[PDB]
Each structure stands twice: as structure tokens, then as C-alpha cells.
mmCIF file with all atom_site columns, C-alpha atoms in Angstrom:
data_model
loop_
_atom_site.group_PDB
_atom_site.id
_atom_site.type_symbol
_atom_site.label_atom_id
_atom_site.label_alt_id
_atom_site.label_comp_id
_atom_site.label_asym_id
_atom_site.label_entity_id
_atom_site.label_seq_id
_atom_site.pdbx_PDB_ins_code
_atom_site.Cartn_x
_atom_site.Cartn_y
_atom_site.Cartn_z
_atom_site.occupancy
_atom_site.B_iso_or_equiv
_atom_site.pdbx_formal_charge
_atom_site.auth_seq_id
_atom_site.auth_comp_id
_atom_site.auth_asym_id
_atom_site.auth_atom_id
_atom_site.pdbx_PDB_model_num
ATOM 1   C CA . UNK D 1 1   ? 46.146 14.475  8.994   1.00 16.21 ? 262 UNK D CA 1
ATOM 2   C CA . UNK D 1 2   ? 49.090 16.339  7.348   1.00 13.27 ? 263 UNK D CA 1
ATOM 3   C CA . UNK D 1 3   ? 51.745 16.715  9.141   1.00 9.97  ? 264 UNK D CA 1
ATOM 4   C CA . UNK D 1 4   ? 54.629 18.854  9.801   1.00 9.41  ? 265 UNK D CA 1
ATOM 5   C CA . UNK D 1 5   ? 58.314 18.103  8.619   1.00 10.82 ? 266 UNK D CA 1
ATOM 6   C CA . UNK D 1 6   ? 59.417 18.672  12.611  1.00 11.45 ? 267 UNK D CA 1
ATOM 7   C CA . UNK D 1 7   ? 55.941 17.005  13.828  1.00 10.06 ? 268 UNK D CA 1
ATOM 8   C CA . UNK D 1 8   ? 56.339 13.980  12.006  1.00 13.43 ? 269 UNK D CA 1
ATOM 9   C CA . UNK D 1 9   ? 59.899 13.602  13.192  1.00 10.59 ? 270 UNK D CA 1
ATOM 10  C CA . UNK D 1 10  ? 58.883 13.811  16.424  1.00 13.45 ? 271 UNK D CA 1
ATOM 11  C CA . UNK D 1 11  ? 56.059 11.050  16.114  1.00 13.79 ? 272 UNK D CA 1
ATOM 12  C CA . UNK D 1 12  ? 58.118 8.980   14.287  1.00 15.60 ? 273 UNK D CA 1
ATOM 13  C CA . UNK D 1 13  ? 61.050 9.103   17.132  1.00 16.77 ? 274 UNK D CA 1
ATOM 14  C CA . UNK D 1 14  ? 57.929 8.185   20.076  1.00 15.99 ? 275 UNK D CA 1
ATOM 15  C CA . UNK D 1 15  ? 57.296 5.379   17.909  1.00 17.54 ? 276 UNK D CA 1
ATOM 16  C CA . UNK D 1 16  ? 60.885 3.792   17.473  1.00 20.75 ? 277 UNK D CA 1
ATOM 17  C CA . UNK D 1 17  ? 61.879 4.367   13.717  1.00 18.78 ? 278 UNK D CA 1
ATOM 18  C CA . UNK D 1 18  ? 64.823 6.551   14.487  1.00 21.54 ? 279 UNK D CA 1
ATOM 19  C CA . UNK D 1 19  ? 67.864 4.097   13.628  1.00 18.18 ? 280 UNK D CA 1
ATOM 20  C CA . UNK D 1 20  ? 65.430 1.521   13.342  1.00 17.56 ? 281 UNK D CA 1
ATOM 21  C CA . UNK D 1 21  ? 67.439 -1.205  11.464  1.00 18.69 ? 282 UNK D CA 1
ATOM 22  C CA . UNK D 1 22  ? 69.702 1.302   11.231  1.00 17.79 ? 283 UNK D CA 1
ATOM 23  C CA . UNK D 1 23  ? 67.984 4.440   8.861   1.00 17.97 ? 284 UNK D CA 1
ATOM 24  C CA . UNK D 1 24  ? 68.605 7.751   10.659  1.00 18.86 ? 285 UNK D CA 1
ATOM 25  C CA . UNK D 1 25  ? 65.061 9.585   11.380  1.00 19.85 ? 286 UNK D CA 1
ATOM 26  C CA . UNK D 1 26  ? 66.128 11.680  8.126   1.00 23.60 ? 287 UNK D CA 1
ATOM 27  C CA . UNK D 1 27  ? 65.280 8.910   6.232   1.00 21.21 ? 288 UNK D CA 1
ATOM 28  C CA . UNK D 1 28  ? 62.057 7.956   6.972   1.00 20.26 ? 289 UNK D CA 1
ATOM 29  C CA . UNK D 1 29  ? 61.455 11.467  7.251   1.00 21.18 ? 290 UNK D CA 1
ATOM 30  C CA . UNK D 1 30  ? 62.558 12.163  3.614   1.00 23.49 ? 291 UNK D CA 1
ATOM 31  C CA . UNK D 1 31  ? 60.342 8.788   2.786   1.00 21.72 ? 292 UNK D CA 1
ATOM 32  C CA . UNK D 1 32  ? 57.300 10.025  3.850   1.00 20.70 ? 293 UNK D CA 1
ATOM 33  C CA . UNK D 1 33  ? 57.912 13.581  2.609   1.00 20.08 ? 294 UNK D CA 1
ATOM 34  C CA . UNK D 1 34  ? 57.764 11.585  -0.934  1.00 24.75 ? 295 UNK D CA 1
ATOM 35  C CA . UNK D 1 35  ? 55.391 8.828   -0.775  1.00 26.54 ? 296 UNK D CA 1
ATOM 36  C CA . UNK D 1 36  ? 52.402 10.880  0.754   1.00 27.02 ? 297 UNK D CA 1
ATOM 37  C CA . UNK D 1 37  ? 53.628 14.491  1.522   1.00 24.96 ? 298 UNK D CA 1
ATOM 38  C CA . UNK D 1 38  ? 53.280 13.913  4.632   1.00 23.65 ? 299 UNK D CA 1
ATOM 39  C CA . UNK D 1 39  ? 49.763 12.966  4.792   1.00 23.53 ? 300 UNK D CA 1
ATOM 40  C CA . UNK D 1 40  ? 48.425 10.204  6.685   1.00 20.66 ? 301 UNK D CA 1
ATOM 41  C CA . UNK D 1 41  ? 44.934 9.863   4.222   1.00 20.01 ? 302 UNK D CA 1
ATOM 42  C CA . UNK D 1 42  ? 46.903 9.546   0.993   1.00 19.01 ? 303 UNK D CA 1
ATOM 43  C CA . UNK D 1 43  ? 46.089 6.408   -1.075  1.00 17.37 ? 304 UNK D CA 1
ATOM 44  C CA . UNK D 1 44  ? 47.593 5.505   -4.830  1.00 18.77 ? 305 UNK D CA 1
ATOM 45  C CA . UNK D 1 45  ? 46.337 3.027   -7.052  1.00 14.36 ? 306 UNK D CA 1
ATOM 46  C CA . UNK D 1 46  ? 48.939 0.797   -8.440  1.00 13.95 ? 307 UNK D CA 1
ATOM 47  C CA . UNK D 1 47  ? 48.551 -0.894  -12.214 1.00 12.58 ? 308 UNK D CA 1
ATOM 48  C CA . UNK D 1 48  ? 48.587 -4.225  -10.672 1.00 12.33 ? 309 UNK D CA 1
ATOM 49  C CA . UNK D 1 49  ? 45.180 -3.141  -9.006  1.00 12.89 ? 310 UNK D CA 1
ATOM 50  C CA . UNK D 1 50  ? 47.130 -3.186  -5.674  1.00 13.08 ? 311 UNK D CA 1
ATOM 51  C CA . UNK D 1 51  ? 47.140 0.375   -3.211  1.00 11.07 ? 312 UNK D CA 1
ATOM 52  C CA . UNK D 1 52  ? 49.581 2.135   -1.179  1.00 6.04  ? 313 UNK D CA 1
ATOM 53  C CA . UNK D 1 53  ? 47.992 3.282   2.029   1.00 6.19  ? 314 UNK D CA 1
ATOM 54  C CA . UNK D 1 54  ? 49.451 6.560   4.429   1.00 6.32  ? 315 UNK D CA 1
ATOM 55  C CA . UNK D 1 55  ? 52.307 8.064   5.115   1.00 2.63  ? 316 UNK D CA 1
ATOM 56  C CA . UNK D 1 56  ? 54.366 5.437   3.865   1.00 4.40  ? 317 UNK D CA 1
ATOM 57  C CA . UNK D 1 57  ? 52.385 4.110   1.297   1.00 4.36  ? 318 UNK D CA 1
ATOM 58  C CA . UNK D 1 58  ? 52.509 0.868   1.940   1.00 7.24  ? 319 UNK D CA 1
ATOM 59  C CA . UNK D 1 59  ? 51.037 -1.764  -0.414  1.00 9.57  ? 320 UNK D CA 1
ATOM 60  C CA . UNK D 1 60  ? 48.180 -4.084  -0.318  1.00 11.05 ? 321 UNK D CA 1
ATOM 61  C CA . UNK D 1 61  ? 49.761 -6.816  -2.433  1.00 10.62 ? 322 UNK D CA 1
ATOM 62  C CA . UNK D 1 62  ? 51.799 -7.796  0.754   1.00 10.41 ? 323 UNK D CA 1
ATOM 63  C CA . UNK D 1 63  ? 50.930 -6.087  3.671   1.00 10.96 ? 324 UNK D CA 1
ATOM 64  C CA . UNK D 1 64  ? 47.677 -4.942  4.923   1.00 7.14  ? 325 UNK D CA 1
ATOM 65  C CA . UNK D 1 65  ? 44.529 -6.069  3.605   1.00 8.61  ? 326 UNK D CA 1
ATOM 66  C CA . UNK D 1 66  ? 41.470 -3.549  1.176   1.00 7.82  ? 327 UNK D CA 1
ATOM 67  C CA . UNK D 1 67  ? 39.667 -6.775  0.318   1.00 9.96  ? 328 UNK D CA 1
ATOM 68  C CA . UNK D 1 68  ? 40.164 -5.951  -3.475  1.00 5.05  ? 329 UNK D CA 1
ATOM 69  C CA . UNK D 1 69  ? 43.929 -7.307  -4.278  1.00 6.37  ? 330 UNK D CA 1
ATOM 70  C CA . UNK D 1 70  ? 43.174 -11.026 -5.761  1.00 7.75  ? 331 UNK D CA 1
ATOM 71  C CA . UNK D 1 71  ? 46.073 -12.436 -4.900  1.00 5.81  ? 332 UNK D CA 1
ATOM 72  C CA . UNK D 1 72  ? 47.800 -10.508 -2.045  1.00 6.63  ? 333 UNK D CA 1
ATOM 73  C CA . UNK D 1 73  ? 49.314 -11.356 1.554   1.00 7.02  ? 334 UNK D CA 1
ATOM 74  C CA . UNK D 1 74  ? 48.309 -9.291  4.719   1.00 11.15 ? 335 UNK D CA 1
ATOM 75  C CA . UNK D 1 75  ? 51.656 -9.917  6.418   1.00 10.52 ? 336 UNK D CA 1
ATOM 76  C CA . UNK D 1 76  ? 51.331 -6.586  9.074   1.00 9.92  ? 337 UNK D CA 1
ATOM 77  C CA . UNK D 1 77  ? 47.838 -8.464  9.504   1.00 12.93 ? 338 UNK D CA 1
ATOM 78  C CA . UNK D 1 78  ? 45.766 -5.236  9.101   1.00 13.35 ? 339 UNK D CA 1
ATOM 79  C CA . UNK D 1 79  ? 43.146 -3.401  7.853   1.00 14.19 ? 340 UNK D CA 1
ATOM 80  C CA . UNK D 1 80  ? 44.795 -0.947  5.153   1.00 14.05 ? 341 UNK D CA 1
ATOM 81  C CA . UNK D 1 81  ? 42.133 1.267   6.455   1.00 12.19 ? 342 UNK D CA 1
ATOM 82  C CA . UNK D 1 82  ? 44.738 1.322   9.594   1.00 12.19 ? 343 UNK D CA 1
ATOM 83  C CA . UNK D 1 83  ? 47.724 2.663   7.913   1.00 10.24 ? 344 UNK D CA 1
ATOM 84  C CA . UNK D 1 84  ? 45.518 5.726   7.058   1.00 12.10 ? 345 UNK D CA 1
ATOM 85  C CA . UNK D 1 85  ? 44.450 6.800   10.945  1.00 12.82 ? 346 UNK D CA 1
ATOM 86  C CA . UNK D 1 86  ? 45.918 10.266  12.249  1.00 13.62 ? 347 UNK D CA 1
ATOM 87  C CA . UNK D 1 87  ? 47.780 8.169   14.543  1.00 13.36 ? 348 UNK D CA 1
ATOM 88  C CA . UNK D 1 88  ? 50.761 6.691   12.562  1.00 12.61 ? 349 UNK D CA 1
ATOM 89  C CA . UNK D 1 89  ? 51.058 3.608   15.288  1.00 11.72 ? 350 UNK D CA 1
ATOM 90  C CA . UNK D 1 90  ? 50.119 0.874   12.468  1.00 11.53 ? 351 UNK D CA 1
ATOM 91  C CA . UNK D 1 91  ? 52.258 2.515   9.967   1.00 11.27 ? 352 UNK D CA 1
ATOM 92  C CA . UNK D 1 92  ? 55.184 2.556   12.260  1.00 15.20 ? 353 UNK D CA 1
ATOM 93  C CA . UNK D 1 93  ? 54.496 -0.997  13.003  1.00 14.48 ? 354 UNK D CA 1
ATOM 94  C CA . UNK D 1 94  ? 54.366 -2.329  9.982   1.00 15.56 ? 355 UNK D CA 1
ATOM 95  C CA . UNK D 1 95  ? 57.561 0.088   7.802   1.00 17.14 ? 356 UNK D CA 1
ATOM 96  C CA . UNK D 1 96  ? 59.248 -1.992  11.221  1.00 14.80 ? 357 UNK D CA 1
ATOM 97  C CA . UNK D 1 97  ? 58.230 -5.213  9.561   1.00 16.04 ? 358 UNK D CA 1
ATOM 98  C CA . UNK D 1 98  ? 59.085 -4.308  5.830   1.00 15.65 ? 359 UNK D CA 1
ATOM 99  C CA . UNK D 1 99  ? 61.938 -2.731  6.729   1.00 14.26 ? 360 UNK D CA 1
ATOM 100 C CA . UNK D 1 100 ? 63.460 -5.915  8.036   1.00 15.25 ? 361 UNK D CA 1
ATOM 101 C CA . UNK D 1 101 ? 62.169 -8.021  5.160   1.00 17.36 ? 362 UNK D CA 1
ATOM 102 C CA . UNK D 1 102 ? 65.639 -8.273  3.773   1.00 13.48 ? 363 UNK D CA 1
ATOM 103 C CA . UNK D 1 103 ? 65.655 -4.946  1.634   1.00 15.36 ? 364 UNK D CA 1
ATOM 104 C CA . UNK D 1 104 ? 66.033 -2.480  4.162   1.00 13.47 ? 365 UNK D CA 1
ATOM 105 C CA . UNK D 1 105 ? 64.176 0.852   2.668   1.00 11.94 ? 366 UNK D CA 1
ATOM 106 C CA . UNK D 1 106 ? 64.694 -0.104  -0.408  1.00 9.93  ? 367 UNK D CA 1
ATOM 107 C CA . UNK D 1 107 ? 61.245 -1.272  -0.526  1.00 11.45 ? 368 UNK D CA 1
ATOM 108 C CA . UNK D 1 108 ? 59.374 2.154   -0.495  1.00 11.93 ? 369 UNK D CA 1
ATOM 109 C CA . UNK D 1 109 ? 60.239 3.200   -4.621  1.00 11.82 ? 370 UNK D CA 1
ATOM 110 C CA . UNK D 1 110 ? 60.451 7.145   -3.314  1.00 12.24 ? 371 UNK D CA 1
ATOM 111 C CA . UNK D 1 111 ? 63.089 6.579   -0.783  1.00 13.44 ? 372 UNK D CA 1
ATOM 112 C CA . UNK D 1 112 ? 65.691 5.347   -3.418  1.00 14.22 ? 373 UNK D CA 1
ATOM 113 C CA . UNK D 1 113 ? 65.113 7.119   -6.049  1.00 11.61 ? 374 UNK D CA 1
ATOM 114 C CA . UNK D 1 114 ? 64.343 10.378  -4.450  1.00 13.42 ? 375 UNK D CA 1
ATOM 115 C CA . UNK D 1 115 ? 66.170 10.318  -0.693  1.00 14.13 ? 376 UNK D CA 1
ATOM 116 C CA . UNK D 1 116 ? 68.532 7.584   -0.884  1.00 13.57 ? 377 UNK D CA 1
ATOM 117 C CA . UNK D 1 117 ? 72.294 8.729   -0.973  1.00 13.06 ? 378 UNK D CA 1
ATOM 118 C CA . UNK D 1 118 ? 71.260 12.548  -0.241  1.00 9.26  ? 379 UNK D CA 1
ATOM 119 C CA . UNK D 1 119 ? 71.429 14.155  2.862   1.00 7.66  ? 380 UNK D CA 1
ATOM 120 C CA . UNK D 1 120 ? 68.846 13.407  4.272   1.00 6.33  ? 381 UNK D CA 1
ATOM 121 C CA . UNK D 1 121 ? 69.515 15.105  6.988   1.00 5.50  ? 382 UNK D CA 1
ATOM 122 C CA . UNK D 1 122 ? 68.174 18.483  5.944   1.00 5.30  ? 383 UNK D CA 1
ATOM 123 C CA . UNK D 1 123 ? 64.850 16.360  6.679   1.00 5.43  ? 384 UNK D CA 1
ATOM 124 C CA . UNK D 1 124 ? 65.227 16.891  10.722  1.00 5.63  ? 385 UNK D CA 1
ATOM 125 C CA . UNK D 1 125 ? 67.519 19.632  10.483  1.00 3.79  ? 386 UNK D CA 1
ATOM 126 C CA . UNK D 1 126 ? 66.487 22.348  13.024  1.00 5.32  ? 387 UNK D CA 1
ATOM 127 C CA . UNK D 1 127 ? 63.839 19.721  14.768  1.00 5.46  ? 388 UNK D CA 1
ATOM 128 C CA . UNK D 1 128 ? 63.387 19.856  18.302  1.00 9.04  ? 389 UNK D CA 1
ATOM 129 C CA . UNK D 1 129 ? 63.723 16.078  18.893  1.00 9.81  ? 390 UNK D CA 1
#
């Protein structure tokens, strides 16, 4: 599913990210807007053989499992099939998780290079939330 800018917001708000450890929804927003362009099917092949799943892109080395990461941790214990669904529960659930792994967002490479220090903002800006 692609989303919407406004949609997403929305969906990520039901599912407790806004302010979640303290990122505004603008954030996450912005995050998502450049990991996957707001699509929940995306995947990415990292040079470590590892993959970034969804909306978030989050990566098989630590946190879901694909079966094919020798090596690797499944520490949202799920399918990375799961992070993919139209339904962004599982990737809300686990960005909660890695998130607070000490980090913050600092974990997802797009959000501080690309949203981190900008307003971020503009990424909810005339949402009804």
C-alpha cells in the first residue's frame, strides 16, 4: 500500500508513534517519506546481505527474521514478511522497540541524514489529525 503524507500521519497517531519517546509525528512522518516513500511493500538489499522491510525499513540483521541473514537477531520476534502488510501495526510495534534501543531515531540512516534537524513539521502540516 502507498500511502498518503496526511494518511500515514493519521495511522501512525492510532498506533502511538506521535511523541513516542519523544519524536513529534513529523518525524516519523519525514522517516518514512525517505526510507520507503511511503510504501508499505518496499524492500532494499543491504551489502551485508541483510534487508530493510516497509515503511520504515527496518533491518533483518536485528529485528525481524527473512531466514537468509546468517548471523542476525529477530529481536521484534517477527516475520519480516510482517513489516510489509498494508496494516503498519508490526511496523509501529517494532520502530517502538528500536526506537528505545538507546539511539533514539538515529537508527533509521534516512531520518538523520535527510529529516533530522529540519522542520519536520512541514511533514503533518495541514493534516487533519
Amino acid at each position: 500500500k502507498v500511502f498518503g503524507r496526511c494518511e500515514l500521519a493519521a495511522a501512525m497517531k492510532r498506533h502511538g508513534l506521535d511523541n513516542y519517546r519523544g519524536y513529534s509525528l513529523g518525524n516519523w512522518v519525514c522517516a518514512a517519506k525517505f526510507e520507503s516513500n511511503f510504501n508499505t511493500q518496499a524492500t532494499n538489499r543491504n551489502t551485508d546481505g541483510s534487508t530493510d522491510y516497509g515503511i520504515l525499513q527496518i533491518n533483518s540483521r536485528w529485528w525481524c527474521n527473512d531466514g537468509r541473514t546468517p548471523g542476525s537477531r529477530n529481536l521484534c520476534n517477527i516475520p519480516c514478511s510482517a513489516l510489509l502488510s498494508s496494516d503498519i501495526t508490526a511496523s509501529v510495534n517494532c520502530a517502538k522497540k528500536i526506537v528505545s534501543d538507546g539511539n533514539g531515531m538515529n537508527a533509521w540512516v534516512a531520518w538523520r541524514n535527510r529529516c533530522k534537524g529540519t522542520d519536520v513539521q512541514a511533514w503533518i502540516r495541514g493534516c487533519r489529525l
